[PDB]
Write a protein that holds these residues in place. Structure first.
Motif, PDB file in Angstrom:
ATOM      1  N   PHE A 126       0.666  -1.734  -0.102  1.00 24.07           N
ATOM      2  CA  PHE A 126      -0.129   0.025  -0.146  1.00 24.07           C
ATOM      3  C   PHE A 126       0.653   1.365  -0.280  1.00 24.07           C
ATOM      4  O   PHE A 126       2.349   1.474   0.403  1.00 24.07           O
ATOM      5  N   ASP A 127       0.094   2.403  -0.495  1.00 25.39           N
ATOM      6  CA  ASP A 127       1.104   3.363  -0.218  1.00 25.39           C
ATOM      7  C   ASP A 127       1.023   4.366   0.803  1.00 25.39           C
ATOM      8  O   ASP A 127       0.046   4.375   1.683  1.00 25.39           O
ATOM      9  N   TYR A 128       1.788   5.135   0.980  1.00 27.54           N
ATOM     10  CA  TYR A 128       1.386   6.569   2.297  1.00 27.54           C
ATOM     11  C   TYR A 128       1.621   7.383   1.467  1.00 27.54           C
ATOM     12  O   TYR A 128       1.966   7.904   0.535  1.00 27.54           O
ATOM     13  N   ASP A 167       9.662   4.547   3.589  1.00 32.22           N
ATOM     14  CA  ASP A 167       8.012   4.485   3.435  1.00 32.22           C
ATOM     15  C   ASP A 167       7.627   3.376   2.850  1.00 32.22           C
ATOM     16  O   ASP A 167       6.344   2.952   2.561  1.00 32.22           O
ATOM     17  N   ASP A 168       8.612   3.260   1.136  1.00 34.71           N
ATOM     18  CA  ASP A 168       7.892   2.213   0.996  1.00 34.71           C
ATOM     19  C   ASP A 168       8.070   0.973   1.447  1.00 34.71           C
ATOM     20  O   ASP A 168       8.850   0.574   1.410  1.00 34.71           O
ATOM     21  N   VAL A 169       7.271   0.412   0.419  1.00 35.90           N
ATOM     22  CA  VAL A 169       7.243  -1.014   1.470  1.00 35.90           C
ATOM     23  C   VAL A 169       6.344  -2.579   0.188  1.00 35.90           C
ATOM     24  O   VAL A 169       5.869  -2.512  -0.031  1.00 35.90           O
ATOM     25  N   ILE A 170       7.282  -3.973   0.710  1.00 34.16           N
ATOM     26  CA  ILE A 170       6.631  -4.893  -0.229  1.00 34.16           C
ATOM     27  C   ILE A 170       6.414  -5.819   1.368  1.00 34.16           C
ATOM     28  O   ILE A 170       7.851  -6.159   1.985  1.00 34.16           O
ATOM     29  N   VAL A 182       2.602  -5.798  -8.252  1.00 35.32           N
ATOM     30  CA  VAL A 182       3.242  -4.877  -7.171  1.00 35.32           C
ATOM     31  C   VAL A 182       3.777  -4.239  -7.480  1.00 35.32           C
ATOM     32  O   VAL A 182       4.936  -4.598  -8.427  1.00 35.32           O
ATOM     33  N   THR A 183       3.971  -3.452  -7.232  1.00 33.65           N
ATOM     34  CA  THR A 183       5.824  -2.169  -7.238  1.00 33.65           C
ATOM     35  C   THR A 183       6.990  -1.809  -6.153  1.00 33.65           C
ATOM     36  O   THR A 183       6.142  -2.300  -4.817  1.00 33.65           O
ATOM     37  N   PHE A 184       8.058  -1.698  -6.092  1.00 34.22           N
ATOM     38  CA  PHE A 184       8.618  -1.742  -5.012  1.00 34.22           C
ATOM     39  C   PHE A 184      10.287  -0.618  -5.887  1.00 34.22           C
ATOM     40  O   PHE A 184      10.492  -1.078  -6.843  1.00 34.22           O
TER      41      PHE A 184
END
Ligand SMILES: [Mg+2]
Length: 462
Positions: free
Chosen positions: A232-234, A329-332, A372-374
């Motif tokens: 998800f994004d923040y 903040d980026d997450v997988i 999905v991206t990262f």
RNA sequence: UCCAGGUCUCUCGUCGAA
RNA sequence: GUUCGACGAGAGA
RNA sequence: GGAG
């Protein structure tokens, strides 16, 4: 995070700073060749493209703070993540000043090409006037730290970069907070060993991707995250952070072996002070992006946060089967059973966090290995070697980059760097990219790598 | 007249002299 | 070629 | 403010 108080810098004995108001970015020889939706960010209140109040826009990220205590979910979250980190043997002993400043395995030297921050910026003093990697001199540095001390205000600058034309119109430019050379050094002494242990161990034990090379790391990620994907994004993560999350970070730092005097450095991140132009202002909460440890501490907190939300929303969740990799903040992440990210976003809201669907999607629908991206990259398994995975940056992002330049002299380096990103989209897409580059005179003067040479070096890297 | 724009990671390029 | 060093650029967070 |  919340701006608590603003005063003129003159009141507080600080000088006006002088903040660059002009972009280095200009259209390149490829501007008309490729399509693009981005332009240089607004840097000043009198930008003709502005359709809203600029200063309101840039400081709007400070959405406020929740006033809540460290609850039972947080405590359990901190205990679980601290237990992982304990396996890494992080030393809480101060890093040797020479290593802290000029580099060691796992931790590069201070960047001597960047500003030295306050007060040096107002004294016409550069990092290079104080430090040199050739001599590794510490004499002038010790003296500047003795003289000017620590906990100096960070200097706010508008970040010079491309932004969507929507964000140009709304003046939604990003801010950076320049850490004083002194504080950067003190931070690196105090937390340098943690920094390098993270840098050396990207993966699901640190819960961090800092130090990774996406060309090699992307193949490892699906092995580490073999459950159902969570992403998800923040919105404005850094500035959204409430003091309670820093309290959590300090607690996990204590469980690592740090003492109170050392965890007190986090108080300068959380409860920070800044110079912008002719103003001096105080922010409570928010990770000041540009402090030393920005990436590591944002990632550590992200590891605390997502565990907390899982524990709160789902009782009887087993964190031992949870896996996550954060970069700030980026997450997988993954869990063996489907997790509703919309429910996590709901709990997040009460903790003062704004969580939206991954990759600016419409709903919190299923996240798949295909979508999905990262680090802005998709995941695509090699069609020949299915255990090797391509990091795939979208061609549109590669297009936005090539359409601008900070200096036409760097055209060869810039375009070659983009090729190394582009080829993972596949040979057909790559050759179309090379072709459009060759459609203008300068393009035909560049030395560009062959697809086959790139694929070959990549396979070789394993 | 000229300079002023963070923390970090990775990668490429130009220089190296072991 | 390979390491490690110093300098430039690009990208990401 | 720094520098020429
Ligand atoms: Mg993401």
């Amino acid at each position: 995070g919340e701006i608590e108080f603003i005063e003129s810098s003159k009141d507080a004995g600080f000088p006006v700073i002088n903040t660059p108001s002009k972009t280095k970015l200009e259209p390149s020889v490829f501007h008309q060749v490729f399509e693009g939706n981005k332009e240089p960010a607004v840097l000043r209140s009198g930008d003709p493209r502005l359709k809203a109040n600029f200063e309101e826009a840039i400081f709007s990220k400070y959405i406020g703070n929740v006033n809540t205590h460290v609850d039972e979910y947080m405590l359990e979250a901190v205990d679980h993540y601290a237990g992982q980190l304990a396996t890494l043997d992080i030393s809480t002993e101060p890093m040797k000043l020479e290593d802290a400043v000029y580099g060691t395995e796992g931790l590069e030297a201070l960047d001597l090409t960047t500003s030295a921050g306050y007060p040096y910026v107002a004294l016409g003093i550069k990092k290079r006037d104080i430090l040199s990697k050739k001599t590794k001199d510490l004499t002038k540095l010790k003296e500047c730290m003795d003289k000017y001390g620590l906990n100096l205000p960070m200097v706010t600058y508008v970040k010079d970069e491309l932004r969507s034309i929507e964000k140009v119109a709304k003046g939604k430019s990003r801010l950076i907070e320049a850490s004083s050379l002194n504080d950067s050094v003190a931070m690196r002494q105090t937390f340098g060993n943690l920094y390098k242990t993270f840098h050396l161990n990207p993966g699901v034990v640190t819960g961090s991707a800092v130090g990774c090379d996406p060309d090699l790391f992307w193949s490892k990620i699906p092995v580490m995250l073999d459950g159902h994907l969570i992403a998800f994004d923040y919105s404005g993560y850094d500035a959204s952070l409430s003091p309670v999350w820093f309290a959590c970070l300090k607690m996990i730092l204590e469980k690592l072996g740090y003492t109170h005097k050392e965890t007190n450095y986090i108080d300068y991140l959380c409860n920070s002070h800044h110079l912008y132009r002719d103003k001096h202002y105080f922010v409570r909460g928010g990770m000041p992006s540009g402090c030393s440890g920005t990436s590591i501490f944002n990632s550590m907190i992200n590891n605390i946060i997502i565990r907390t939300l899982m524990l709160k929303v789902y009782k009887g969740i087993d964190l031992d089967q949870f896996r996550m990799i954060a970069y700030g903040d980026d997450v997988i992440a993954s869990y063996p059973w489907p997790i509703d990210a919309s429910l996590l976003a709901e709990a997040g809201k009460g903790y003062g966090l704004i969580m939206t669907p991954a990759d600016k999607g419409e709903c919190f629908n299923e996240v798949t290995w295909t979508n999905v991206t990262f680090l802005k990259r998709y995941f695509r398994a090699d069609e020949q070697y299915p255990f090797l995975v391509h990091p795939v940056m979208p061609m549109k992002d590669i297009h936005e980059s090539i359409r601008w330049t900070k200096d036409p002299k760097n055209t060869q380096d810039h375009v070659r760097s983009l090729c190394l990103l582009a080829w993972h989209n596949g040979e057909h897409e790559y050759e179309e990219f090379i072709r459009k580059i060759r459609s203008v005179p300068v393009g035909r003067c560049l030395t560009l790598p062959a697809f086959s040479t790139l694929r070959r070096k990549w396979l070789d890297s394993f």
